[PDB]
Subunit: 352 residues, 3 copies
């Protein structure tokens, strides 16, 4: 009905106010769901539930590791006396979600290698510390960290263990050593379009198109503008992949579009007031993220580490630090950032 | 005559005031020339013309790519609402000049590979964004970026494409793997001295001695102190190359002196009030830049990327952040920095 | 007697006040001794003497290079007009001590290769500049550099020269390329416990257990809490080495515990008011430093450079930038940091 279309969209402030006075177990589950959703800048528990459903569709071992990471990161943020409003908003759980997910994804062992849950825990514990340190650094420029605890922690882990580790071996990443055989006639446009939901789903490390579809559904039910910019960023990523002559097997996998999804979501509406100048700037940031992800992948394959989400964080920080005399390119303060619709409403209200 | 020796030297403020009220096409050409000259801290359109002549002497394809990069960077700075006084001073064109130049230099394809003009444009467009982000960062310490948009953009491009790219392959850079055979009797001092103008010309990527001579001529006609410090920095680079046992073929090429030229120019008179303490500090910064360029070259050859001008930027930022109780080592504010002669005049006026 | 137990412990303020009015040669020797001791956060000349004795026990060539580095760094800090109170406190000599030490340790040539004293001097001269630049950066967050001049300088040197240099070749560092054969039955617990003093001694690059014992003695006679946290950090390093499946030959060498010693010393009492929360945070920082040192070692072996003390500096900066609502985790201002006992006394006095 029309009544649920108000209590299920946005950040779900009504449900948050209703749950604020309940058992702390339910509040912790709500925080874990919001942290699951917050990977794509969504503070919605129902979106988090749908994202968890998608993770289960992809790989139940991966969602086990991700849930463990989120729980451990939220608990470490509680124990470290972090801001309760940030913990209740899932801002201390998405880095741990990604840590657990990508530590299960890049594990050379089989599924359900239960010994992997010790590094998952010990690395997800270090996400609140990195988040607080990087916030102490960035607070002088009103910048978010965006995934930098996760990137630092997972790069540290995948370099400490490496492929030739005895307990927790990682997958082998090697630099390119031969000009790829690219036959442009053997090109599947069905798979190219399928790489848009796969590109959205690769934000969590899931190469299944149905999980990407579920993620898109969650994005839409929280904020349609976030879903639109996610789709457009994935398209931009695919296009930039094609423009630099990339093997089609890498474009189909979505390994070229998940760093542009987050950049488009962040620039177009989330941390800039959404206008058409902001939309073009988001497209430019998605393109810059695609090319920077190419660079960082080719550069970190030498060390044997996957690119992670370094490209997204770096280029989004770059485009947030950009200063423009255009009054239509307006960067919202970090305290007034909820989602593109409310952001645009606040922008219009403070401008007029 | 003596009259032109006033309207052709310095930043050419008289010609700038005369052109301020003319057709915007002429003003844009003036901005492009000033941006060409601003690579070596020179805000002079005639110096930019002489530098363009030198680029034509080296390789007309390289000057085509460089001119395209400068034009595209100035246009992107205009579209992004950047500061008009900084665009009119060429501060938004030298990074694009270097981007285009070094993207044509490190291209595996032949000359006039017209498809290279698309990455040149798309990478020169990203130089104003990087410049504005790094200025938002550095404004808290009164620091210039010095070439950091260019370094970031070109490293990103040369890592995204790489040697094994299908469309835009780059030259192969490999780390050292054997102790070089250095015969100190087969040593040409003529070529050693020729490596000083070649070292000045390698700032733009030109290994021809006549282009380096033309660059020196431009430096002198704008500011004789800049030309002197450029020559001394190139000498210091050559000496530091000899001191660490470098193959003579690399010293002759000037690949050891172009990162010390810029450092000496920046420290001795440009961003410090020129004294003898400042001169010694500039020599020390040139030596530090030579050794840091050795390090960064040996370190980035593993990733297959040339050192660029990372050494210069890093060591110059280091020597500008240096705090000294010596009243003779005075760092000018970024608003009062034009060229060493005017800088010293301002220093004397505000000190006395 | 009980009288010397007051004039030999702590920062030796009485002896400093007595020597303040003597020949500048004696004052310079005192500064060099304090700089030798300041590697492990100790401003004590007797501790510096004992550390020099330990360096002589390890390798007289290494202590020659270290002493030369300390002298050259203190002289360069004097010539660069640095703060006299920081030079008198050895804050400008420990980076040069480590530079000289680790440049002699990682030299492919034999002992007493007297030509190595030129790079030692020229690299120790660059430690005051790096220290002043990084202090100008960190002063906005009240952070110490902790060894960052040393890390930058020594990484720069070992990358500029490299293994295949003709004058100053360095030792060959190669990345791991095969899963290590780890026989847990062939495990020596005697050597495991011996790796605690060896882990403390590897802070200076000394793998001898007697030098580590001497270092522990110096730590204790200056501040027993510093010695305790050094031992605990070395233990934590050994444990984290065991937890990630490390070859026993690397654990015995102490190459896994010297980056946790400094982190534990820095967090537990030195730069945080020593409590039990601070002690647990120091253990966590030591564990994070062990894993980050694993990562940085595996990552910098690709470039052929040893990890140095990058892990310590980075993780300690991370844990100092951490902001906590816990009133018991209190970060002292940089001006009121002498040693854990005086730090705790000051904390109690300002809290009550
Ligand atoms: C930006 C978004 C753009 C979206 C465009 C969406 C679609 C874009 C690509 C679709 C067209 C591909 C044409 C099929 C094969 C053509 C061919 O075979 O060669 C023709 C030339 C390649 O020259 P080559 O001789 O090396 O051929 C290689 C085969 N060989 C090696 C065996 C000889 O093609 C091009 O120069 C493509 C130029 C790309 C223009 C976009 C610029 C983006 C670069 C920015 C990087 C910043 C970092
Ligand atoms: C600073 C500016 C200085 C300008 C000086 C300008 C000129 C400087 C170099 C000109 C002299 C070269 C002598 C000809 C060959 C000598 C030889 O063959 O060997 C004699 C020794 C090398 O010892 P080795 O046994 O390895 O011989 C190698 C041959 N082999 C491997 C086959 C056995 O020479 C030296 O130790 C040179 C010491 C350099 C002093 C300057 C210090 C700068 C280092 C800073 C790094 C910071 C980073
Ligand atoms: C934290 C401090 C903890 C201190 C603990 C102090 C002691 C900790 C280690 C002592 C126990 C070693 C057991 C002897 C060999 C066992 C064995 O052989 O295998 C059993 C499994 C390994 O599985 P796998 O099949 O690969 O066997 C490898 C042999 N193969 C390849 C030939 C098949 O063991 C484990 O999963 C150990 C789990 C480690 C738990 C600590 C988590 C720390 C990770 C944080 C990283 C963040 C970055």
């Amino acid at each position: 009905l029309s009544k649920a279309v108000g209590y299920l969209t946005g950040d779900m402030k009504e449900y948050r106010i209703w749950l604020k006075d309940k058992h702390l177990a339910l509040q912790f589950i709500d925080w874990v769901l919001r942290g699951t959703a917050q990977v794509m800048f969504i503070n919605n528990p129902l979106s988090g539930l749908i994202i968890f459903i998608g993770l289960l569709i992809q790989n139940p071992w991966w969602t086990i590791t991700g849930g463990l990471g989120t729980v451990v990161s939220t608990l470490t943020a509680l124990a470290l006396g972090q801001d309760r409003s940030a913990i209740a908003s899932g801002l201390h759980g998405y880095n741990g979600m990604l840590v657990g997910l990508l530590m299960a994804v890049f594990s050379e062992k089989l599924d359900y290698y239960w010994w992997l849950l010790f590094p998952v825990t010990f690395t997800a514990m270090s996400c609140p510390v990195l988040s607080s340190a990087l916030n102490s650094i960035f607070s002088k420029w009103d910048l978010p960290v965006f995934t930098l605890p996760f990137n630092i922690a997972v790069t540290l882990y995948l370099a400490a263990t490496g492929h030739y580790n005895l307990f927790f071996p990682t997958t082998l990443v090697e630099p390119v050593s031969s000009v790829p055989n690219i036959t442009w006639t053997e090109m599947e446009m069905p798979l190219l379009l399928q790489a848009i939901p796969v590109g959205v789903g690769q934000v969590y490390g899931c190469d299944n198109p149905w999980t990407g579809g579920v993620f898109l559904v969650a994005l839409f039910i929280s904020s349609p503008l976030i879903c639109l910019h996610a789709a457009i960023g994935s398209i931009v990523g695919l296009l930039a992949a094609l423009s630099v002559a990339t093997p089609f097997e890498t474009i189909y996998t979505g390994l070229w579009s998940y760093n542009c999804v987050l950049s488009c979501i962040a620039i177009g509406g989330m941390f800039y007031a959404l206008t058409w100048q902001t939309h073009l700037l988001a497209l430019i940031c998605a393109l810059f993220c695609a090319y920077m992800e190419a660079a960082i992948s080719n550069i970190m394959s030498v060390v044997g580490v996957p690119p992670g989400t370094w490209a997204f964080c770096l280029a989004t920080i770059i485009f947030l630090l950009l200063t423009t005399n255009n009054p239509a390119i307006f960067r919202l303060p970090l305290s007034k950032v909820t989602y593109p619709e409310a952001n645009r409403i606040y922008y219009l209200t403070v401008k007029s």
